[PDB]
From a paper:
The overall structure of OvTIM is similar to that of other known TIMs in that it contains 12 α-helices, three 310-helices, and eight parallel β-sheets, forming a classical α/β barrel fold.
We constructed four variants, including a SAD deletion variant (ΔSAD), variant in which the SAD region was substituted with AAA (AAA), variant in which N115 was replaced with Ala (N115A), and double variant (N115A_ΔSAD). Interestingly, the ΔSAD variant exhibited a lower protein thermal stability, with a Tm of ~3 °C, compared to that of the wild-type. In the ΔSAD variant, the corresponding region (K153–W158) was not defined except for the molecule of the region which is stabilized via an interaction with other symmetry molecules, while the AAA variant showed a similar structure as the wild-type. The electron density of N115 of ΔSAD was not defined and normalized B factor of N115 in ΔSAD structure and wild-type structure were 42.71 Å2 and 16.01 Å2, respectively. Furthermore, the efficiency of OvTIM ΔSAD to isomerase DHAP to GAP showed slightly lower than that of wild-type in the quick activity check assay. The overall stability of OvTIM was also affected by the SAD motif and N115 in a complementary manner in that the Tm decrease in the ΔSAD variant was rescued by N115A substitution.
Numbering used by the authors:
A (entry chain A): 5 to 249
B (entry chain B): 2 to 152, 158 to 249
The structure:
């Protein structure tokens, strides 16, 4: 499985700050075998895509589930491709739990983006109370089912596991905790999709990924890379891109 | 007499592409538009910087939504500071589609509006009641509750008759005027008579070339927040509805 590192800039960006990140990426020494993606705010997708070499993926942080319609404030996969962007992050914890996106809506968005030729990082993960209640797998499998339900092709999907308690808090999952969930999700893929898809699908870890912990997480057999939050805005991102080498 | 500048905003909603945007920009650039009308267009967020470059500053370019802090851990959200950064000075907030499909609360719309204003962005603040709310006699209760959550030189109020938009019913100009008058009276009592006299309240029900002039004549209707017709030649006729 090809190692995959995505940088989620979240709601951070400006012409000046973006240019600084683009310069950092352009002049960085990155393992050529790592797939690298950045996800700027939507206003900046066309300019970031124009300024960054195609070696880097440029992703939207969200999109909707049809090509057009009466959805004030939403953008569609057709629009992403129109501005040269072929990736989207869907189902991020902030969208599910702060902006109230349902499992079903995330599944519909995912099926639509894939149908439109857009690659999807599909995010799943459990809250602290769910983890303490022993419901990590139940939650991850429920969220995965809503994504899997109507999908028949997985070659344009990356799964991102981010425990909600690890997002923005500094409380990174231990490498054993991350490995345990990725292996459980991969074994779910073996029985619910196919062993071939399970062996090839990238499952990346998110949630307080840093230069300091990325190499230990990356060596876990079922961790295939990272979805990076705050550290994607810093030079630390380059070290995370290099975590597998 | 009242002395409010007529205001027409075109909400493109989730419609747009480089090719189709260029056609609309060409249409806007070469049209005969009433010079006394304030004109705004609102493209999908991906296209805001380019639409703002291509359109003369005579036209406002608005985001269709934004969030309530300048930056932070809100994947998929954009802030007023980013709008200013790409040259856009306007945002639509509280649109019925955001309230009812994307589940935005009264409080969240109020927080976004206050923040956008604080950042230096002008706001089209959208309000309006659904069919069962109107049938329950709650038109004013709903509109006033939505207004209170926001509560002005950088605000335009848009009234959306959701009870008509979502059902296929037609709102009459008398029904639009009735709500606009109630909202202006709310502004007069809850803010000030000076603000009430100057604030533009624009109509956000279905507006086409066929009904725009009759709606525009209403004394408390100051323009339109246009839906589907903003993508079509009707938009120019609607911009000219007052003159």
């Amino acid at each position: 499985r090809k190692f995959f590192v995505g940088g989620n800039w979240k709601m951070n960006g400006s012409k000046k700050e973006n240019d600084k990140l683009i310069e950092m990426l352009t002049h960085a020494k990155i393992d050529p075998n790592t797939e690298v993606l950045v996800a700027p705010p939507a206003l900046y997708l066309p300019s970031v895509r124009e300024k960054l070499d195609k070696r880097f993926h440029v992703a939207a942080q969200n999109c909707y589930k049809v090509p057009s319609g009466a959805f004030t404030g939403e953008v569609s996969p057709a629009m992403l491709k129109d501005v040269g962007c072929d990736w989207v992050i869907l189902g991020h914890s902030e969208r599910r739990h702060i902006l109230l996106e349902t499992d079903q809506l995330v599944g519909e968005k995912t099926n639509h983006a894939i149908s439109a030729g857009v690659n999807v990082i599909a995010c799943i993960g459990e809250k602290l109370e769910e983890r303490e209640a022993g419901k990590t797998e139940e939650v991850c499998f429920r969220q995965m089912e809503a994504i899997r339900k109507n999908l028949s092709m997985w070659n344009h999907i990356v799964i991102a596991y981010e425990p909600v308690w690890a997002i923005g808090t500094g409380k990174t999952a231990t490498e054993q905790q991350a490995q345990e969930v990725h292996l459980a999700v991969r074994r779910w893929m073996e029985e619910k999709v196919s062993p071939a898809v399970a062996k090839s699908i990238r499952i990346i870890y998110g949630g307080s990924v840093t230069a300091a912990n990325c190499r230990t997480l990356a060596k876990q057999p079922d961790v295939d890379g990272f979805l990076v939050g705050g550290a994607s805005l810093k030079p630390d991102f380059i070290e995370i891109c290099n975590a597998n080498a």
